[PDB]
């Protein structure tokens, strides 16, 4: 509905799509970056629409690598089946994804060293550290930096026990004005949370039998199922202490196996799966 021509003069990247190969990457992966050296980084959780990804990656190489994992796409099995993306599964997949979940290094520089996960979980500052690694720096992603909100909460819940991300008071969920602080609020949401209080609301529906395994639902006034299913589960790498893997699953490696006919279309999605593999695809039928 217009033109083209000698439009011979672009282009841009694969972050024509949205990756901030912007001062973004090249300023987390730099410095640290030289002054030394030859290693350093420094991990970031960026949330999907359903699952909450906390891949604890660290820079370099052909292409940046994965110190370990995280991601609460299944903080369910581990004890927390409803509430995916509840801004305490930021606390959760916080410690629980990476942080303590991180890692071998990791659990090792921890589970005895560092650790303090949270040694709390009440509640306030810092919550920093004092020895030492894997000193992972935050690197949100793109998401906007709104005082109190998922991201900058995977932080505050993660390093509430573990890493040295360097997370500062200010934006941590709740508390401001006019000054600090503010102690209680965090203690709250952190402790999944304040959707209990929001589960006050009386009128039409909500969940289901997940509003029957809920409802109480910790209420009462919130201390029976909310901050309990939490408290307990909400202690997952500390209490509940597991891999970050955790149950690797690998049941993944099981589910293929599962595709359900036929080929495919593109067909290479058939065969693909079909066991792990079967024909060509990512082999002799793609990149």
């Amino acid at each position: 509905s217009s033109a083209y021509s000698s439009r011979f003069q672009t282009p841009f990247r694969r972050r024509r799509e949205g990756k901030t190969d912007y001062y973004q990457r090249k300023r987390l992966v730099t410095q640290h970056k030289a002054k030394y050296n030859t290693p350093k980084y420094r991990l970031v959780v960026r949330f999907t629409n359903k699952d909450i990804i906390c891949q604890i990656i660290s820079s370099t190489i052909t292409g940046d690598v994965v110190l370990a994992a995280a991601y609460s796409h299944e903080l369910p099995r581990y004890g927390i089946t409803h509430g995916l993306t509840n801004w305490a599964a930021a606390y959760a997949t916080g410690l629980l994804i990476a942080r303590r979940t991180l890692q071998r290094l990791g659990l090792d520089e921890t589970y005895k060293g560092v650790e303090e996960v949270e040694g709390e979980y009440e509640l306030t500052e810092a919550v920093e550290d004092g020895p030492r690694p894997f000193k992972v720096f935050l690197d949100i992603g793109l998401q906007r930096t709104t005082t109190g909100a998922r991201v900058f909460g995977a932080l505050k819940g993660a390093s509430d026990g573990g890493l040295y991300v360097p997370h500062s008071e200010n934006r941590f969920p709740g508390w401001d004005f006019e000054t600090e602080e503010i102690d209680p609020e965090l203690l709250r949401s952190y402790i999944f949370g304040g959707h209990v209080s929001q589960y006050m609301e009386e009128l039409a529906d909500d969940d289901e039998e997940r509003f029957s395994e809920l409802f109480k639902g910790y209420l009462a006034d919130d201390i029976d199922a909310d901050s309990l299913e939490d408290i307990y589960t909400s202690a997952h790498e500390a209490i509940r202490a597991d891999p970050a893997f955790k149950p690797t699953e690998k049941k993944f490696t099981k589910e293929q196996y599962a595709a359900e006919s036929k080929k495919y279309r593109q067909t290479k999605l058939s065969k693909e799966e079909r066991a792990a593999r079967v024909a060509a695809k990512i082999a002799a039928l793609a990149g």
Partner: protein, 119 residues
């Protein structure tokens, strides 16, 4: 007509063709080496990693690595006598080289012991 510090540079310190902006974040990774031979090559994006003119095109060897982005140095030398001057350039402007015969140092030595047993 005047003699300012970027003078004549209009095309030397040029840019690109289409790669007309933003450091290849590779050209930014990579680690120096208090000894490895670097090859200057200025790039207007930056600007300490602009190498004041003459030292353009000239290849030398890293003597400093203040690796905090601060590239290294090297020197080279110049005309009448060669008085070797050193210049502290920046990490975004320099590049590796063709000391790539150490590949044939290897080839040599190794193939030469395999030559010992061979002989």
């Amino acid at each position: 007509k005047s003699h300012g510090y970027r003078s004549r540079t209009r095309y030397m310190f040029q840019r690109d063709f289409r790669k007309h902006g933003a450091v290849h974040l590779s050209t930014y990774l990579k680690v120096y080496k208090v000894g490895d031979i670097v090859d200057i090559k200025a790039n207007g994006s930056i600007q300490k990693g602009m190498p004041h003119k003459f030292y353009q095109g000239k290849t030398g060897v890293v003597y400093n690595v203040t690796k905090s982005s601060v590239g290294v140095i090297i020197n080279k030398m110049v005309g009448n006598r060669y008085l070797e001057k050193r210049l502290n350039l920046r990490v975004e402007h320099i590049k590796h080289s063709k000391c790539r015969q150490e590949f044939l140092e290897r080839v040599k030595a190794n193939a030469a012991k395999r030559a010992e047993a061979k002989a």
